[PDB]
Design a protein around this ligand. Structure first.
Ligand SMILES: *C/C=C1/C(=C/c2[nH]c(/C=C3[NH+]=C(/C=C4\NC(=O)C(C=C)=C4C)C(C)=C\3CCC(=O)O)c(CCC(=O)O)c2C)NC(=O)[C@H]1C
Ligand SMILES: C=CC1=C(C)/C(=C/C2=[NH+]C(=C\c3[nH]c(/C=C4\NC(=O)[C@@H](C)\C4=C/C)c(C)c3CCC(=O)O)/C(CCC(=O)O)=C2C)NC1=O
Lengths: 313, 315
């Protein structure tokens, strides 16, 4: 099972008890966005990230009482329709907000049980996706498909390194294609133990298909009532991209000289086939609309991997 | 019975009846729909060879002026991008798309693909989070029926089409409407089945490779290519991969008889086989702009993935 998180008197994570860290309930988020939780019926804001005043530009104490109906008049009905009770926690709804202080904010919402998790990130105000889609489909084999995919992602994102990381039947990883800036170590062809991506991350990654660490040296921001008032229990954050990353993985990234990391799951037949895995040497917050393009490419790659492996076999 | 294509009409082939439907060479009609323009050009030199008769209206140039220049001079910034994106030997299904600022006609969408040594260039006029929200809603649909309903309603909301159907093929190629979203007052096609001939075999083969086709106005006359044959080969110009390709007159007649002014469908391909179609109707003529159509092309791919996933749970 899982050990309690640290803020509930749980043990420190070591190389011996990796697979057991409750990565989904860290009680904190990354500092390039803000997170609120709220009651699914009343719209009452229950928890907030201690940095919410920066993004929402509103006295920090004003928000805990207010309802979403007050804070977000136009969006609160849509949220109710888009995320009905009993929907999966993988279902997400997104909108762009015109906030008085912070300008354009991207808003991403999902539902876990009776709680709505709301994520706020800055955002901006063409044919590369369509051109990439046709390029992927005309790749003649799996090897060429892998190369086109990593090159395409690098061109869209500017990431210093983009890898296609494939799991073996025992969850050993292999870098089968790589696009990278000149002057980086090549990881192409190298193989890595299964425990570098432990079983509970792999399970989580089969259900929520995008995760990132925008800055491998930034401190996490705690959620208000670390615990959910509804349940007096930790708030599930595995579907929040803003969720804090495991410190173990953050140490691993720093030792690799990586300032920013992002991966997208490739899921084939209900199983985690591999990852589009990205590195940047410096910190790098990919804006939400560009992340959506990678999310689309993830689905397209999942389709094309099946198509291609049906030709191989 | 399976039989090879007739020569097209302009090469003395016979007129098409309900008796020889499957033999209509629908991929080489020698003409296009009038809401865009088409050029062909030599894949290596860029010399312009054929143009639809309306190309001057769209490009604001004399035909003899257009034909007297290479793509390198006509599209100086796009020409190197075309060469890189569509290398010799590449499949005819591969498409490259760009947007041009053209003085006489505003923003034009340029779509290009390569058939052998020929580049085919299509020009059309062109002009928030709905796609992402639809992606997640499709993946969360609990079963095939819910998936089909969300897909048809989503497409109708994005396009405004009077009728959007999910049309599924049976093993004998007959078809059935298994979900539909429709304008108030329209009668239901839900549950209705149709003979295999209504989408003949050469169409089904074509639709497994080129995943979107349309008729923007089912009464509009087609616009000939000039000259009609490819000068490289003194043979017909393959247009199966061109959305501007003229529609079979047999199918246009069928649509008119049904009261349809505009028609569009997107292939759903599963395991290399044409599983079904997102099929759309409008009572009046209706031109969907190319960037909107791209959203439908993406949904066609998502739907192919999700139909596979939903049917695996059905076993
Ligand atoms: C003599 C041959 C005939 C024939 C030819 C034909 N049909 C198509 C294409 C399509 N037919 C479709 C059929 C239907 N649309 C509907 O809405 C319904 C039912 C409610 C049916 C049965 C469809 C969907 C297509 C695809 C194109 C589109 O989406 O509009 C072609 C190929 C046309 C082309 O791509 O140029 C041809 C040659 N149809 C007949 O009925 C017989 C008489
Ligand atoms: C070049 C090779 C290469 C490799 C092999 C690689 C691995 C990799 N690990 C990932 C995640 C995690 N790893 C661990 C833990 C452990 N990792 C260890 O090494 C031991 C000490 C340990 C256990 C005690 C945990 C808890 C997580 C989940 C973090 C979270 O989601 O919060 C991810 C996905 C996230 C991303 O894309 O950045 C990747 C892609 N990334 C590379 O570039």
């Amino acid at each position: 099972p899982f050990f309690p998180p640290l803020y509930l008197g749980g043990p420190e994570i070591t190389t011996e008890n990796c697979e057991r860290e409750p990565i989904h309930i860290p009680g904190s988020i990354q500092p390039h966005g803000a997170l609120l939780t709220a009651d699914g019926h009343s719209g009452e804001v229950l928890q907030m990230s201690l940095n919410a005043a920066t993004f929402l530009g509103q006295e920090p104490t004003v928000l805990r009482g207010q309802t979403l109906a007050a804070l977000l008049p136009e969006q609160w009905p849509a949220l109710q329709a888009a995320l009905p009770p009993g929907c999966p926690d993988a279902l997400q709804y997104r909108a762009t907000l015109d906030w008085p202080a912070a300008g354009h904010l991207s808003l991403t919402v999902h539902r876990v049980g009776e709680l709505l998790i709301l994520e706020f990130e800055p955002t901006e105000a063409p044919h590369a996706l369509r051109n990439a889609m046709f390029a992927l489909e005309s790749a003649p084999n799996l090897r060429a498909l892998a190369e086109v995919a990593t090159q395409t992602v690098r061109e869209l994102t500017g990431f210093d390194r983009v890898m296609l990381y494939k799991f073996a039947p025992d969850a050993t990883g292999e870098v089968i294609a790589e696009a990278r800036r000149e002057g980086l170590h090549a990881f192409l062809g190298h193989r890595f133990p299964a425990s570098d991506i432990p079983a509970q991350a792999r399970a989580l990654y089969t259900r929520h298909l995008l995760r990132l660490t925008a800055d491998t040296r930034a401190a996490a921001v705690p959620l208000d009532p670390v615990l959910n008032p509804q349940t007096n229990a930790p708030t599930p954050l595995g579907g929040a991209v803003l969720r804090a990353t495991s410190p173990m993985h953050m140490q691993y990234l720093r030792n690799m000289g990586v300032g920013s990391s992002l991966s997208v799951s490739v899921v084939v037949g209900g199983q985690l086939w591999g990852l589009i895995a990205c590195h940047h040497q410096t910190p790098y917050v990919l804006p939400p609309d560009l992340r959506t393009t990678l999310e689309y490419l993830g689905r397209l790659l999942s389709l094309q991997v099946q198509v291609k492996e049906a030709l191989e076999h």
